[PDB]
Amino acid sequence: RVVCREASHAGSWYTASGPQLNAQLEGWLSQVQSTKRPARAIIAPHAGYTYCGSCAAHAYKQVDPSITRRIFILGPSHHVPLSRCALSSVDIYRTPLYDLRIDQKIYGELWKTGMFERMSLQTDEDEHSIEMHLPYTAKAMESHKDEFTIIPVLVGALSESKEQEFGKLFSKYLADPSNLFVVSSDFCHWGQRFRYSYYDESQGEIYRSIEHLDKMGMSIIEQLDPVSFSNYLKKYHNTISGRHPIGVLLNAITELQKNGMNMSFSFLNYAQSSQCRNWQDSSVSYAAGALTVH
Numbered sequence: 001r002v003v004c005r006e007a008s009h010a011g012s013w014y015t016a017s018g019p020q021l022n023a024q025l026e027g028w029l030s031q032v033q034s035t036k037r038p039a040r041a042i043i044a045p046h047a048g049y050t051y052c053g054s055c056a057a058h059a060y061k062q063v064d065p066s067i068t069r070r071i072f073i074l075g076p077s078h079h080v081p082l083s084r085c086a087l088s089s090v091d092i093y094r095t096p097l098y099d100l101r102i103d104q105k106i107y108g109e110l111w112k113t114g115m116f117e118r119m120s121l122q123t124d125e126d127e128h129s130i131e132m133h134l135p136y137t138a139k140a141m142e143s144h145k146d147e148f149t150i151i152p153v154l155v156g157a158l159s160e161s162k163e164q165e166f167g168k169l170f171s172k173y174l175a176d177p178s179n180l181f182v183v184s185s186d187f188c189h190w191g192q193r194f195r196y197s198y199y200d201e202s203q204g205e206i207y208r209s210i211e212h213l214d215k216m217g218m219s220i221i222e223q224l225d226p227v228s229f230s231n232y233l234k235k236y237h238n239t240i241s242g243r244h245p246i247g248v249l250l251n252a253i254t255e256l257q258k259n260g261m262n263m264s265f266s267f268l269n270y271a272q273s274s275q276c277r278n279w280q281d282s283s284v285s286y287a288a289g290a291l292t293v294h
């Protein structure tokens with residue numbers, strides 16, 4: 001049995017040198033003023049750090065490392081035909097900063113729901129959408145580096161009913177101030193290379209239409225409304241890569257509202273990998289945001 005998941009995208013999606021990566025993350029985090037501490041959930045991108053690291057800092061700066069003790073990371077599956085969610089087979093997730101330990105107690109509880117499959121080590125290491133949050137998490141939590149655990153969850157192509165069921169399942173954990181939910185997603189992938197060319201001419205340039213479409217989705221997320229978000233996906237089919245983890249989060253939020261809790265979500269930074277101006281251009285969008293529970 002292999003006990004460690006190697007940092008299989010280090011050096012290609014982010015800097016492999018621990019000390020240099022540490023300084024790069026520190027630099028991006030220093031440019032952000034914390035406004036939403038202590039975040040109970042964040043939405044953050046999963047592209048290479050050269051493209052999205054500055055944006056992701058706006059989410060990670062909202063984590064209060066003196067409060068958060070367990071960090072769920074829900075990332076969408078890119079390679080495998082997964083219809084449910086999957087849990088890791090290893091005990092430790094490596095990063096160039098320091099290695100992260102999976103919460104064995106919660107992993108046992110989750111497994112006993114019967115709702116999860118077990119992803120192989122090969123599946124685990126092939127996916128990047130969880131790994132891209134490990135260095136940032138390690139950096140955000142370094143002042144308490146030996147006092148927190150992670151709960152990695154691979155999120156497949158969930159049906160609406162599975163988004164509802166997993167949302168209700170995770171809601172009991174979302175209600176605990178010691179827990180943090182990292183919801184991994186990029187926003188619009190625009191261009192012929194993505195077979196996506198939706199364009200609202202009332203917005204002007206293509207990149208402004210992309211910004212408007214993304215921000216329609218971001219505003220719906222801020223309305224805490226999973227049905228509205230599903231309807232928006234059905235209407236425009238925006239290529240939001242973590243739409244299923246987001247659907248899980250929104251259903252968890254509505255479950256907590258039914259239990260009498262009150263919540264607020266705010267997006268804090270929006271960016272595009274480039275600015276599309278003609279039909280042959282392509283770009284990927286990034287958005288960072290935080291959920292506050294009082």
Ligand SMILES: N[C@@H](CCC(=O)N[C@@H](CS)C(=O)NCC(=O)O)C(=O)O
Pocket residue numbers: 012013046047048049051186189241273284
């Ligand atoms: N170096 C990595 C990452 C490259 C990368 O991050 N590309 C951007 C687009 S310029 C991106 O957004 N990737 C994640 C996504 O498409 O959602 C690779 O070769 O795939």
